[PDB]
């Protein structure tokens with residue numbers, strides 16, 4: 001543990017001239033990033049070379065755009081330190097204080113506390129989704145087209161070595177992708193990883209902060225409801241997302257659920273593709289296995 005922290009202490013002090021690290025600890029870990037709490041006050045997110053060679057650049061541009069244009073009491077990261085290069089990216093900002101939303105916390109809230117939280121979320125999303133996004137217009141994301149390009153990569157690499165069951169799962173997904181209309185609706189700036197782990201509560205269980213806009217972009221409006229609609233141990237439940245969708249208004253709830261269901265079906269394939277692109281066999285294997293688990297559940 002001690003070594004990462006020393007290297008990152010050194011890099012922070014090298015790239016940010018008058019910054020002094022008096023303490024530093026690991027506060028979280030993606031698959032190709034690490035986040036550090038520094039001086040009990042700053043979050044420093046860091047990444048070395050990956051497939052998204054313009055990744056902390058876009059995230060920074062999004063924080064800048066949102067801090068300029070949103071009118072909200074909800075806090076988001078405000079970037080004070082940045083170093084962006086092919087081989088290394090670092091973003092630093094003051095830690096937003098609060099407690100992450102969890103199923104457990106939610107279930108201790110009164111009905112009225114739950115409603116206020118859902119209203120806060122709906123309000124935040126209505127405001128972000130309504131922003132004129134001309135100034136960040138390079139941050140477009142076309143999920144349907146990305147899937148098509150990922151399927152072509154599969155065809156060019158490992159598809160022919162897959163089993164029939166794996167191939168059928170993929171083709172069956174592609175058929176559904178080609179029949180769906182859920183990519184043809186409203187586009188807007190979305191957080192795009194909007195789940196419990198990114199939502200902070202204050203001491204009254206109201207929404208006080210939102211973090212990790214690392215996958216944000218201009219994309220289908222439905223994107224931001226996918227995790228709020230998820231029925232799993234890590235998320236609150238389908239009821240929660242439905243109620244939020246009703247409060248948000250002016251959105252087709254059945255298509256939001258179809259969008260969620262298609263992204264969920266894609267997940268094993270997304271996992272395999274991640275493995276191909278980043279030369280990690282473990283992910284290719286996990287995705288293929290997941291296909292068998294899903295095929296045999298019913």
Ligand SMILES: Nc1nc2c(ncn2[C@@H]2O[C@H](COP(=O)(O)OP(=O)(O)NP(=O)(O)O)[C@@H](O)[C@H]2O)c(=O)[nH]1
Nearest residue numbers: 027028029030033035043095096097098211212214
């Ligand atoms: N309290 C608090 N925790 C934060 C804050 N920023 C980050 N964290 C913590 O640090 C973890 C990692 O931060 P995050 O932006 O989500 O990065 P990531 O998902 O690991 N990386 P990537 O965006 O590169 O895939 C979060 O899950 C959360 O635990 C903050 O402002 N306040």
Ligand SMILES: [Cl-]
Nearest residue numbers: 281284285288
């Ligand atoms: Cl494999």
Ligand SMILES: [Mg+2]
Nearest residue numbers: 197198211212
């Ligand atoms: Mg995160």
Ligand SMILES: [Mg+2]
Nearest residue numbers: 212213214215
């Ligand atoms: Mg992220």
